[PDB]
């Protein structure tokens, strides 16, 4: 019985997309998380999670995806099973820089020092069809001062409109 | 900065509340080996005085669950 305007429903949907995507990249840092594609349908609210390692999404016995469905439905207000999640496999592991930094986080936590880890991820990204890559690591790196370690290979465009896509 | 909030205690070194009572609390009276005489006045029928009794005051009364005030000269 309530409604909101076109000038506010779009920014509410955008905050919904940002909320869902950033909370899934918060708590799903284990597997290879690329992004989500949420479709609009007045019968079933479809949420398509595109992931690299779909095993953590699908769970053991089909548990974690239904648990994420419950996480969405018990706050965002969609009863009677309105929200339905579908997982998609991403065959190109080295295509998503979000997934590459997501793997690099857990590789740099448990040992696997910065030099050899950067050479390994640059070798993997260069093997996975990419034309150019750049990894910048900043912070306390073998010293009390902050030394920005940059590792760049290939062809990288830094200026203009098509940088974002 | 270099500000400081320390202890001066101008007024009192006060403390909090701790409920202290006797060993047990008896409310009844033994008469004729089986008849109980009532000592304290009950509370009226407002879903309070089914098992809640009034506290002894000079002219006031008190419901424990519902805090009812009754006064008589």
């Amino acid at each position: 019985a309530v409604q909101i305007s076109k000038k506010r429903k779009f920014v509410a949907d955008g905050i919904f997309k940002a909320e869902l995507n950033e909370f899934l990249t918060r708590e799903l840092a284990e597997d290879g998380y690329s992004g989500v594609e949420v479709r609009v349908t007045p019968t079933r609210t479809e949420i398509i999670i595109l992931a690299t390692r779909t095993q953590n999404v699908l769970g053991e016995k089909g548990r974690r995806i239904r648990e994420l469905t419950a996480v969405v439905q018990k706050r965002f207000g969609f009863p009677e099973g309105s929200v339905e999640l579908y997982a998609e496999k991403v065959a190109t592991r080295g295509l998503c820089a979000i997934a590459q930094a997501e793997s690099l986080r857990y590789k740099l936590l448990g040992g696997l020092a910065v030099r050899r880890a950067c050479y390994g991820v640059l070798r993997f990204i260069m093997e996975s069809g990419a034309k150019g890559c750049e990894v910048v690591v900043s912070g306390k790196l073998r010293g009390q001062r902050a030394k920005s370690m940059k590792f760049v290979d290939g062809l990288m465009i830094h200026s203009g409109d098509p940088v974002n896509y | 900065k270099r500000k400081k909030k320390s202890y001066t205690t101008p007024k009192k070194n006060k403390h909090k509340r701790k409920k202290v009572k006797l060993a047990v609390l008896k409310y009844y009276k033994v008469d004729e080996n089986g008849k109980i005489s009532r000592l304290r006045r009950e509370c009226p029928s407002d879903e309070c005085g089914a098992g809640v009794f009034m506290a002894s005051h000079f002219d006031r009364h008190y419901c424990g669950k519902c805090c009812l005030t009754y006064c008589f000269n």
């Binding site: 909370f23 918060r26 548990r63 996480v71 018990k74 706050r75 | -």
Partner: protein, 98 residues
């Protein structure tokens, strides 16, 4: 300080029914918004779930104001002690699937 027994069985009954709990950060100081599922707003919910997140029973997540609570198979193995009170029923997360 004693929570009512209806709340102390009801929040764990809701956790038994679903397994996913949701609250927010707003503890009572600007406003008193009651919970969309239960009666107590946030403080008794946090006091009930801190004993689960302290002993490693139910995991904790945060989405910009909101505490989400995450269920584990080991979480159900430790909540078996609460499962002694009903008959042995796996909640609607693990047993059945469509």
């Amino acid at each position: 300080m004693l929570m009512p027994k209806k709340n102390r069985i009801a929040i764990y009954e809701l956790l038994f029914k679903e397994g996913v709990m949701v609250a927010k950060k707003d503890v009572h100081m600007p406003k008193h918004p009651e919970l969309a599922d239960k009666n107590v707003p946030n403080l008794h919910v946090m006091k009930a779930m801190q004993s689960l997140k302290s002993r490693g029973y139910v995991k904790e997540q945060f989405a910009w104001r909101h505490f989400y609570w995450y269920l584990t198979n080991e979480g159900i193995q430790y909540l078996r002690d609460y499962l002694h009170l009903p008959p042995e029923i796996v909640p609607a997360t693990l047993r059945r699937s469509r």
